[PDB]
Paper text:
Cytochrome P450 enzymes (CYPs) are heme-containing proteins that catalyze the insertion of oxygen into a wide variety of substrates. In the current study, we evaluated CYP153D17 (NCBI Reference Sequence, WP_010183267.1) from the endosymbiotic bacterium Sphingomonas sp. strain PAMC 26605. Sequence analysis revealed that CYP153D17 has 48.27% identity with P450pyr hydroxylase from Sphingopyxis macrogoltabida and that it contains conserved motifs including an oxygen-binding domain and heme-binding domains found in typical CYPs. In this study, we identified CYP153D17 from the endosymbiotic bacterium Sphingomonas sp. PAMC 26605 as a putative alkane-hydroxylating cytochrome P450 enzyme based on our substrate binding assay and structural data.
In addition, we determined the crystal structure of CYP153D17 at 3.1 Å resolution in complex with a co-purified alkane-like compound. The structure was refined to a resolution of 3.1 Å and had a typical CYP fold, comprising a central heme molecule surrounded by 13 α-helices and 7 β-strands. The putative substrate-binding pocket of CYP153D17 was found to be shaped similar to a cone funnel with a length and outer diameter of approximately 17 and 10 Å, respectively. Notably, an additional electron density map appeared within the substrate-binding pocket during refinement. Because exogenous ligands were not added to the crystallization solutions, the bound molecule may have co-purified with the enzyme during the production of recombinant protein. Substrate binding assay data suggested that the ligand was an alkane-like compound and the electron density was modeled as dodecane. The co-purified ligand was bound to the hydrophobic substrate-binding pocket created by the Met90, Ala175, Ile240, Leu241, Val244, Leu292, Met295, and Phe393 residues. The overall protein structure of P450pyr (best hit in the DALI search) was very similar to that of CYP153D17 (r.m.s. deviation, 0.96 Å for 307 Cα atoms), but P450pyr contained no ligand and the loop region (residues 88–96 in P450pyr) between the α3 and α4-helix was missing in the P450pyr structure. Structural superposition revealed that the binding mode of phytanic acid was similar to that of the co-purified ligand of CYP153D17 as an extended conformation. Therefore, it is expected that for CYP153D17, hydroxylation may also be performed at the end of alkane molecules, such as in CYP124-mediated ω-oxidation.
Author numbering: 7 to 406
Write the structure that this text describes.
């Protein structure tokens, strides 16, 4: 079987073959049912306009029946079910989004701007020139995970624990990478235990920004307790680390493919902010999110039935030629670059978007300060998944 339009296949992303099928799907079937399968049947929502209309309709297309193409996958007593306010609806969703959003008030960005800058500086000065190395590990991960260590508190030493994402379950819960039942789950419990210790370490003092803090001593009018954790902090971890990483990893890789557009940026640091957006578009650190139809419905032609599983391929959206012409080129001056769907749309749009915008900016700032230019050597070891989207290894050196 090569459904071709079964764009679930982790092959396409690892090997970088997703461009053509999603080029056709847009031009002849932007809403298309993949009957079978790999994950079970889905609806490939593959274009810009249609996505928006799904995400602006939280009743017709729920977030509280799973949010990636993976499912609950079990009957009755094997418990599981890890809550997450990204996987919520109705009012409760707005309840809990309230209780983390103040971490990303632009004044908090200004407060954290100065620390972020020291660590971005400090990292880039450890780097040596023309000697090869791994952009992913030495920069994109190393920074990124620092940031998540400050958003919780670890503190510092052994913060590499936060690199237990292993949540590429867009391709891990599908006949088991690890048998699973006491593996990704046990990896997740050993996390939760550790964070429970951190929750009990903070039941004195005021709000110490986010780091549990914000879930309690900073009011938290609801957001009680009761293993929301494996869930909410699963969410927070992945959001606050992996997404940014693959972007930093993409600034090195991406720009280098389009070295003229890089040189213009190199010349003009006022381009930076639009550069950040343009890059976040390009990459789409999460290629897709899924909704689930609660009642029967019409959508761009197609006939969605209560039960059906939707699948919003931002990855293809951000290359919709209706909106961004020559989308498969990085163009750092591209005006509308800010209108990408990588952070998403509607009431779920990434609450951390301003922080990721900062982390990247400062990288490209601290880089300009230094006259860097990252030169990619081999091709990168990509991730194999429909959900996460970037790089496990990037081989580079730096010049001037
Ligand atoms: C380049 C960086 C990032 C990208 C591409 C990204 C992407 C996304 C996307 C696509 C969603 C779902 C959007 C939707 O349904 O409309 C989302 C939700 C979320 N992201 Fe991010 N994200 C990023 C950074 C962050 C950071 C830094 C944090 C936290 C510190 C974070 C926390 C979240 C949270 C909490 C949600 C769920 C919000 C809700 O309930 O609607 N993200 N993110
Ligand atoms: C079981 C696989 C789905 C869970 C993946 C973690 C939650 C995704 C949050 C996205 C970060 C913004």
């Amino acid at each position: 079987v090569i459904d071709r339009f079964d764009v679930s296949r982790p092959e396409l992303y690892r090997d970088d073959l997703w461009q053509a099928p999603f080029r056709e799907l847009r031009a002849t079937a932007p809403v298309h049912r993949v009957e079978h399968s790999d994950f079970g049947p889905y609806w490939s929502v593959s274009s810009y306009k249609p996505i928006i209309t799904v995400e602006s309709l939280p009743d017709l297309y729920s977030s509280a029946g799973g949010i990636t193409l993976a499912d609950f996958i079990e009957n009755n007593p094997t418990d599981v079910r890890m809550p997450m306010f990204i996987a919520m609806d109705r009012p409760k969703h707005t309840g809990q989004r309230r209780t983390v959003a103040p971490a990303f008030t632009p004044s908090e960005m200004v407060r954290m701007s100065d620390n972020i800058r020291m660590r971005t500086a400090e990292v880039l000065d450890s780097l040596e020139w023309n000697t090869p190395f791994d952009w992913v590990d030495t920069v994109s991960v190393e920074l990124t995970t620092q940031m998540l260590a400050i958003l919780f508190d670890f503190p510092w030493e052994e913060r590499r624990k936060l690199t237990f994402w292993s949540d590429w379950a867009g391709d891990i819960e599908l006949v088991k990478n690890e048998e699973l039942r006491l593996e990704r789950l046990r990896h997740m419990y050993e996390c939760g235990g550790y964070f429970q210790n951190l929750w009990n370490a903070k039941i004195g003092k005021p709000p110490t920004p986010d780091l549990i803090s914000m879930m309690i001593h900073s009011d938290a009018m609801a957001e009680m307790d009761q293993m929301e954790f494996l869930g909410n902090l699963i969410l927070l971890i992945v959001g606050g680390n992996d997404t940014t990483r693959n972007t930093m990893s993409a600034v090195a890789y991406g720009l280098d493919l389009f070295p003229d557009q890089r040189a213009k940026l190199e010349a003009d640091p006022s381009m930076i902010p639009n550069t950040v957006q343009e890059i976040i578009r390009w990459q789409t650190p999460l290629a897709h999110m899924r909704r689930t139809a609660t009642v029967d419905s019409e959508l761009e032609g197609q006939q969605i039935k209560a039960g059906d599983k939707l699948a919003l391929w931002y990855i293809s959206a951000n290359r919709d030629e209706s909106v961004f012409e020559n989308a498969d080129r990085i163009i750092v001056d591209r005006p509308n670059a800010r209108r990408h769907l990588a952070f998403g749309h509607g009431i779920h749009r990434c609450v951390g978007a301003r922080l990721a915008e900062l982390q990247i900016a400062v990288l490209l700032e601290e880089m300009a300060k230094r006259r860097m230019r990252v030169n990619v050597l081999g091709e990168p070891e990509r991730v194999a998944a429909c959900f996460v989207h970037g790089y496990r290894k990037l081989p580079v050196e730096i010049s001037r």
